[PDB]
Write a protein that binds this ligand. Sequence first.
Ligand code: HEM
Ligand code: HEM
Ligand SMILES: [C-]#N
Ligand SMILES: [C-]#N
Ligand code: NA
Lengths: 128, 127
Amino acid sequence: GLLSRLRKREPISIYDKIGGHEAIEVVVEDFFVRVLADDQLSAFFSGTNMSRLKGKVVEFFAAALGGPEPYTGAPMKQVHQGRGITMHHFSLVAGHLADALTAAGVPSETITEILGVIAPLAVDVTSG
Amino acid sequence: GLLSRLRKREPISIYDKIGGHEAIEVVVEDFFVRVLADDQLSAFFSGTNMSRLKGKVVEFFAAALGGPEPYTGAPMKQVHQGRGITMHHFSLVAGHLADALTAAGVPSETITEILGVIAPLAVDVTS
Ligand code: HEM
Ligand code: HEM
Ligand SMILES: [C-]#N
Ligand SMILES: [C-]#N
Ligand code: NA
């Protein structure tokens, strides 16, 4: 936990400074409200079990940002390959994530930092 | 509230000097009376859930004006996209918001300041 980590002189992760698992859950739920309300994006999710997807995305984001929870989903490249996702769609999704973070009161500098973790994933997510 | 914020030595926001969230609620009500009575604007809001929109507008204005709570709604570009809103329409809306602020007793200088915050948003809202 954050307390145990501080006793061990480990620096505070992005996961911990934004509020850990509960913060991420709330952000991911809001993120998908936004993504599914966006008609440039909704159709990508037409065949998707959304409770399941959100579960996996919480796990992925938590792990990417320094959380201790395992990611129990499939590899990014495999999942996204062939879905005709361009950098335009990736960027829109990134926008909605930034919006969800903003809505949750995450400081803008920390959102930028998170975007810097997430942006390089576009390589695995997009077709081009 | 403003009291706790001053104790922290935060400078007084536009939000705080106009009376905070309660003042903005009152203005936004009157604002939309003006907008929906305007024949050049009202059809845009045909079938809109006004109650919901109003809460989001209050939230957006509060945040834009330096208020404590984040805006949690859709960004201005996305929400206004594909509506064909012109600078003419935006100007009318801004005019209606100015008149609502005036009617609420907000000093002219502060309405001018608020319009300075609002005016640059025309880039996202229009065309
Ligand atoms: C921001 C970077 C992104 C991350 C971290 C991410 C993460 C994930 C995760 C964890 C899954 C679940 C994998 C599994 O089921 O094991 C998934 C699936 C999926 N993602 Fe993404 N994703 C990202 C971007 C995108 C974008 C930009 C799109 C399209 C606009 C997209 C569309 C999909 C679709 C359609 C699925 C499949 C759901 C299903 O199985 O039907 N993702 N993604
Ligand atoms: C003056 C600056 C403006 C601000 C701050 C503003 C703010 C907002 C907000 C907060 C929303 C709701 C977003 C959401 O649902 O998450 C919205 C939606 C909307 N706005 Fe504006 N707006 C502005 C200008 C305009 C103008 C000029 C028009 C048309 C003349 C307009 C017409 C609409 C319409 C039709 C909606 C959608 C309502 C619905 O959901 O049915 N807005 N705006
Ligand atoms: C991917 N959500
Ligand atoms: C826009 N109301
Ligand atoms: Na695939």
